[PDB]
Amino acid sequence: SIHMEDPILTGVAHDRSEAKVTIVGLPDIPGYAAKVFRAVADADVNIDMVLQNVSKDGKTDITFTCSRDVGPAAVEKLDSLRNEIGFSQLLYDDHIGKVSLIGAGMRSHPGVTATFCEALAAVGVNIELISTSEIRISVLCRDTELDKAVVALHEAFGLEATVYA
Amino acid sequence: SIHMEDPILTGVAHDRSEAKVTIVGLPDIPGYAAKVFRAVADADVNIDMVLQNVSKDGKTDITFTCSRDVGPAAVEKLDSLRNEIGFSQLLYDDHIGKVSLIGAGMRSHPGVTATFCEALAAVGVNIELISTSEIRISVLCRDTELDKAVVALHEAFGLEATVYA
Numbered sequence: 001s002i003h004m005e006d007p008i009l010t011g012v013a014h015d016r017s018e019a020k021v022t023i024v025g026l027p028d029i030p031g032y033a034a035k036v037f038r039a040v041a042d043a044d045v046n047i048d049m050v051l052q053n054v055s056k057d058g059k060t061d062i063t064f065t066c067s068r069d070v071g072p073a074a075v076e077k078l079d080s081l082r083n084e085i086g087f088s089q090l091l092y093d094d095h096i097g098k099v100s101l102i103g104a105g106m107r108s109h110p111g112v113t114a115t116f117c118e119a120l121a122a123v124g125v126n127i128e129l130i131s132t133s134e135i136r137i138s139v140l141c142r143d144t145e146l147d148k149a150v151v152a153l154h155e156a157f158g159l160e161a162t163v164y165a
Numbered sequence: 166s167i168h169m170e171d172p173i174l175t176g177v178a179h180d181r182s183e184a185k186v187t188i189v190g191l192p193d194i195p196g197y198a199a200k201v202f203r204a205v206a207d208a209d210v211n212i213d214m215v216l217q218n219v220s221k222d223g224k225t226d227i228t229f230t231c232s233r234d235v236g237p238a239a240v241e242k243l244d245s246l247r248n249e250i251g252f253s254q255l256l257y258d259d260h261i262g263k264v265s266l267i268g269a270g271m272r273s274h275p276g277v278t279a280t281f282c283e284a285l286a287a288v289g290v291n292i293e294l295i296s297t298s299e300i301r302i303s304v305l306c307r308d309t310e311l312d313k314a315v316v317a318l319h320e321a322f323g324l325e326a327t328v329y330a
C-alpha cells in the first residue's frame with residue numbers, strides 16, 4: 001500500500017541471469033544509438049539496463065544488459081552490422097551479477113547512493129557499473145560477489161516497505 | 166489509474182535546470198564510488214541521474230546530474246578531495262537538456278529504446294548520455310535542442326496514459 005519526504009525502500013533484488021554487451025567506439029553523432037537499438041530489436045532481443053556516459057563529439061560507448069541466453073545472438077547481430085554501426089570492439093561479459101536497491105522517491109538522496117556504495121565497499125565488492133532512478137539503484141558486480149552484496153545491502157538499509165531516514 | 170504486456174507511456178518530461186558532473190579517471194577498486202557520493206552528500210548536494218559504465222579493473226568515470234545552482238559547489242567539494250578520491254579530471258557541463266519518456270513496464274522493449282533514438286535522430290538531436298529503467302528512458306542533449314526533442318518524442322509515441330504496442 002506504500003507502493004513523502006524520505007525515500008521508500010521495498011527490497012534488494014538480485015539477478016544472476018544477465019550478460020553485459022558494450023558497443024565500443026560508436027560515432028558520437030545523431031542516429032548511431034538508433035542503429036544499435038533497432039538492430040537489437042530486429043533480432044527480437046529483450047534488453048534490460050542501457051547506459052551511455054560521456055564521450056572520448058567524437059566516439060563513445062553504449063552498454064546494455066540482456067539475458068545470458070540471448071547474449072551471443074545479440075553480439076552476432078551487432079557484428080553482422082559492424083560496417084553500418086562503425087564500432088571498434090564489442091565487449092561481452094556473461095559473468096555479471098546485477099544487484100539493486102528497489103524503492104520509490106529515491107532521487108536527491110545522494111546520501112542513499114553513498115550508503116549503497118559504502119556497504120558494498122565494506123565487504124570488498126567492486127562496482128562495475130551503476131545506473132539509478134526514482135525506483136532503483138542498480139549496480140553490476142562479479143556474479144561471485146552477488147551473495148555478499150545482497151546481505152550487505154539488507155544490513156545497511158535495515159531490510160515489508162521501509163521509509164528510510 | 167493506469168499509474169500488462171506492452172509498455173505504458175504517460176508523458177515526455179523535459180528539464181533545463183540541471184548540470185552534468187563527470188569524475189574522470191577514478192580508480193576502479195572498492196570504495197571509490199563511495200568516496201565520491203559521500204563527499205557530494207556531505208556538501209548537502211542533491212543528485213539526480215548517476216551513471217558509471219565500463220572501465221578503461223583500472224580506472225573509470227562516474228557522471229551524475231544535479232541542479233545548475235549547486236553544480237559549482239559540487240565540483241569544488243569534489244576537488245577539495247582530489248587526493249583522497251584520486252581522479253584525473255572533473256568535467257562540468259551546465260548547458261544540458263534532460264528529456265525523458267516517462268512510463269511503466271518499459272523494460273525488454275528495445276523496440277521502444279530504438280523508437281526513442283530514431284525520433285531524436287530524425288530531427289538531428291545528438292544524444293550525449295542515456296540511462297533507462299522500468300519507468301523512464303532519459304537522455305541528455307544540448308539544452309538548445311530540447312524543444313525539438315520533446316516534439317519529436319510526442320509524435321513518435323502518439324502522446325492521458327498510452328499503452329504502446
Ligand SMILES: C[C@@H](O)[C@H](N)C(=O)O
Nearest residue numbers: 030031032033291292
Ligand atoms: C552515441 C549515440 O548516442 C549518438 N550520440 C546518437 O545520438 O545516436
Ligand SMILES: C[C@@H](O)[C@H](N)C(=O)O
Nearest residue numbers: 126127195196197198
Ligand atoms: C569506480 C567505483 O565504482 C569502484 N569500482 C567502486 O567499487 O567503488
